[PDB]
Design a binder for this molecule. Structure first.
Ligand SMILES: NC(=O)c1ccc[n+]([C@@H]2O[C@H](COP(=O)([O-])OP(=O)(O)OC[C@H]3O[C@@H](n4cnc5c(N)ncnc54)[C@H](OP(=O)(O)O)[C@@H]3O)[C@@H](O)[C@H]2O)c1
Ligand SMILES: NC(=O)c1ccc[n+]([C@@H]2O[C@H](COP(=O)([O-])OP(=O)(O)OC[C@H]3O[C@@H](n4cnc5c(N)ncnc54)[C@H](OP(=O)(O)O)[C@@H]3O)[C@@H](O)[C@H]2O)c1
Ligand SMILES: CCc1nc(N)nc(N)c1C#CCc1cc(-c2ccncc2)ccc1OC
Ligand SMILES: CCc1nc(N)nc(N)c1C#CCc1cc(-c2ccncc2)ccc1OC
Ligand SMILES: [Ca+2]
Ligand SMILES: [Ca+2]
Ligand SMILES: [Ca+2]
Lengths: 157, 157
């Protein structure tokens, strides 16, 4: 099973402020929607509750609480090891899609990074983890918008 | 000025049937929308007249005719050569977006390929050039849909 990771990171490393992404970069959302289309996303409970289950994708959510869902495209797991063990039974690809805790737990085990760098230095308390040294960028594309962003893909090895 | 290229190619190599793309793979057009958001697109007159000027994009349309457009996001050029001459003075990135004639003319000049391979073998009369030998794939992701597709980015090197 391949693991990808997708994130939008501002210039100071901030990805979140409380439950919110502290910016709106028009157009950036399209990258996320396009790459995650009909994919399994692995997300932490906080991100999942805040974002909700968008249509046309499937969610593996980790929680230590009794959090539940009645959406047929959502699976709730008590641990990451348990999410990954079960996902490997039904898919060959999972996209880690946040938040801070989940990115930090899994970045050493992912194969491909999708990083949109957002041209802003906002206030926030949720940061993206340091990127392991064996990752290298293989593709870059700049976008001009209300807030500028740059999309970059990284491969391990 | 960087040159990219973006195309959806069916499994037998067909990219077009008359003025149309002979398939509908749900989700694939999201990739097109995402990558071309607020970008300059170089297109041939027939593809332009057939697809129209989608919003949040700029178009450089080549024609040997006196074809005109009153769309504020559309520039018309008498040749591909003159389009490139002018585009390099007003942007740093252009995405070659079809159709067949335009792909044939520019494939040897572009830096990056965005290719969506569409899991279908349709009727059609328009094909894509052979991919130049110095291009290598650097990213791949598969998508399950009504028609499956696979997205691959190629770099020259
Ligand atoms: N900029 C971006 O691309 C982006 C993308 C996604 C999210 N974000 C931001 O990131 C912030 C949320 O991140 P966060 O780090 O606070 O929370 P989070 O990673 O989304 O979720 C944390 C929660 O996940 C559960 N969890 C974490 N590790 C677990 C484990 N090993 N086993 C079982 N459950 C586990 C716990 O749930 P319980 O509390 O239920 O026990 C924990 O409270 C938000 O601001 C969000 O907007 C930004
Ligand atoms: N599958 C995909 O991802 C994709 C994407 C785009 C298009 N397509 C397909 O491609 C097909 C249409 O392509 P096509 O090859 O027939 O036509 P085209 O490339 O879209 O347009 C050709 C026209 O461009 C102008 N032109 C070409 N070279 C020129 C030059 N050097 N200088 C000035 N003008 C030049 C001429 O316009 P004038 O006639 O006005 O002189 C020519 O008729 C359609 O079936 C469409 O669906 C597929
Ligand atoms: C679109 C940014 C984004 N970009 C990239 N490159 N990766 C990501 N992981 C996210 C993200 C995220 C998480 C996220 C997404 C949305 C969202 C709202 C409306 N349409 C789509 C998504 C809302 C809340 C949210 O977390 C509070
Ligand atoms: C989704 C196609 C597409 N997919 C891929 N992978 N590559 C491409 N090059 C194109 C293409 C094209 C041609 C094209 C398509 C649209 C379009 C219209 C309505 N919804 C989405 C797109 C607009 C203008 C345009 O050229 C003037
Ligand atoms: Ca943490
Ligand atoms: Ca770290
Ligand atoms: Ca020419």
């Amino acid at each position: 099973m391949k693991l990808s990771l997708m994130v939008a990171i501002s210039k100071n490393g901030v990805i979140g402020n409380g439950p919110d992404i502290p910016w709106s970069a028009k157009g950036e959302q399209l990258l996320f929607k396009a790459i995650t289309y009909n994919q399994w996303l692995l997300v932490g409970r906080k991100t999942f509750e805040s974002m909700g289950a968008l249509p046309n994708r499937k969610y593996a959510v980790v929680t230590r609480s009794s959090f539940t869902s009645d959406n047929e495209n959502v699976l709730i797991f008590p641990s990451i090891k348990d999410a990954l063990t079960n996902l490997k039974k039904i898919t060959d690809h999972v996209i880690v899609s946040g938040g801070g805790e989940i990115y930090k737990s899994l970045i050493d085990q992912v194969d491909t990074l999708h990083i949109s760098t957002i041209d802003i230095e906002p206030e926030g308390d949720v940061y993206f983890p340091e990127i392991p040294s064996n990752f290298r960028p293989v593709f870059t594309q700049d976008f001009a918008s209300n807030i500028n962003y740059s999309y970059q893909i990284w491969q391990k090895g």
